[PDB]
């Protein structure tokens, strides 16, 4: 039921993507970043693996 009321997917996804704009990212990590965003977009936000993916993406974009 909660899925029909709120969704924070787009905000965090765009927050990740905006960091990519200024960076000349190599392909061998561009594909990894893209696939991790894809995985995060289909994963429940309360799972531990979701937080692991989020932290890994934050470190990648840092």
């Amino acid at each position: 039921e909660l899925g029909l009321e709120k969704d924070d997917k787009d905000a965090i996804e765009e927050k990740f993507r905006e960091r990519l704009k200024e960076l000349v990212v190599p392909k061998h990590v561009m594909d990894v970043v893209d696939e991790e965003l894809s995985k995060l977009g289909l994963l429940d936000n309360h799972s531990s693996e979701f937080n692991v993916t989020r932290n890994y993406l934050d470190w990648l974009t840092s």
């Binding site: 039921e1 909660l2 029909l4 009321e5």
Partner: peptide, 10 residues
């Protein structure tokens, strides 16, 4: 909107 009547109950 209408689903809130059951969401709040849950």
């Amino acid at each position: 909107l209408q689903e809130q009547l059951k969401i709040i109950k849950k």
